[PDB]
Design a protein around this ligand. Structure first.
Ligand SMILES: NC(=O)C1=CN([C@@H]2O[C@H](COP(=O)(O)OP(=O)(O)OC[C@H]3O[C@@H](n4cnc5c(N)ncnc54)[C@H](OP(=O)(O)O)[C@@H]3O)[C@@H](O)[C@H]2O)C=CC1
Ligand SMILES: CC[C@@H](C#Cc1c(C)nc(N)nc1N)c1cc(OC)c(OC)c(OC)c1
Length: 192
């Protein structure tokens, strides 16, 4: 797969874009999790699948029985990994571009975490899309948080809902989704 277009997909607490605390997520948003599954899994054509790409620590964060994420090609990046195809669903590599050179019959490519990977790849020109779930809370400063996105969103353009709807096909997009004290919305951004 040569020069694929790649999407970052992430859920972040506004305005500081917090995404984790001590290696774990600071919320469990059931509908958001289902959205993550649907969008990363769904393809627009028959006989293909998507690839999900993540750093080694994000991989290890998944309970070993629940990885690889089903119905998607899983790609894990480590600075200690030489290129290796583990099985049909798992690839080891040290860069996204080189990992994807090993691949065919893949439609969309998503970056699914974590912070370090996100903060590097936002400045990689293969990334064309940001699927950001904007989370809001009455007192965001009260949420334990030590991990943040460093995204230069001034070089990006938040698209209208119709563009996101087009991207996700028939996936249902509910506005102002509320779980506990969190409210959230799915967004789509493209390079300015
Ligand atoms: N809110 C959300 O939607 C999400 C949040 N998260 C959050 O992110 C946090 C974890 O992120 P973080 O700790 O940064 O972990 P990451 O998953 O980003 O992994 C970092 C590791 O990835 C590998 N890596 C980084 N850069 C490269 C590179 N250029 N080439 C090859 N390998 C590379 C390295 O592995 P190695 O050391 O083996 O070389 C590095 O140690 C958690 O708190 C989690 O909750 C994660 C996913 C989603
Ligand atoms: C390994 C990817 C990470 C994520 C994410 C993620 C989510 C939820 N939402 C959005 N908008 N972007 C993301 N990138 C993730 C960790 C987990 O902990 C074991 C999961 O099981 C509970 C999980 O369910 C599949 C997913």
């Amino acid at each position: 797969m040569l020069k694929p277009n790649v999407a970052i997909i992430v859920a972040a607490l506004k305005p500081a874009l917090g995404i984790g605390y001590k290696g774990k997520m600071p919320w469990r948003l059931r509908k958001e999790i289902r959205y993550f599954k649907d969008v990363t899994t769904r393809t627009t054509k028959p006989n293909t699948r998507n690839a999900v790409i993540m750093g080694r620590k994000t991989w290890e964060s998944i309970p070993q029985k629940f990885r690889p994420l089903p119905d998607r090609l899983n790609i894990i990046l480590s600075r200690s990994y030489e290129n290796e195809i583990i099985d049909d669903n798992i690839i080891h590599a040290s860069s996204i571009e080189s990992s994807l050179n090993l691949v065919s019959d893949v439609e969309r490519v998503f970056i699914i975490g974590g912070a370090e990977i996100y903060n590097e790849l936002i400045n990689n020109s293969l990334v064309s899309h940001l699927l950001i779930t904007e989370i809001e809370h009455p007192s965001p400063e009260s949420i334990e948080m030590d991990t943040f996105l460093k995204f230069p969103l001034e070089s990006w353009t938040k698209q209208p809902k119709s563009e996101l709807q087009k991207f996700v096909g028939d996936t249902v997009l509910e506005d102002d989704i509320k779980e506990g004290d969190f409210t959230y919305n799915y967004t789509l951004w493209t390079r300015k």
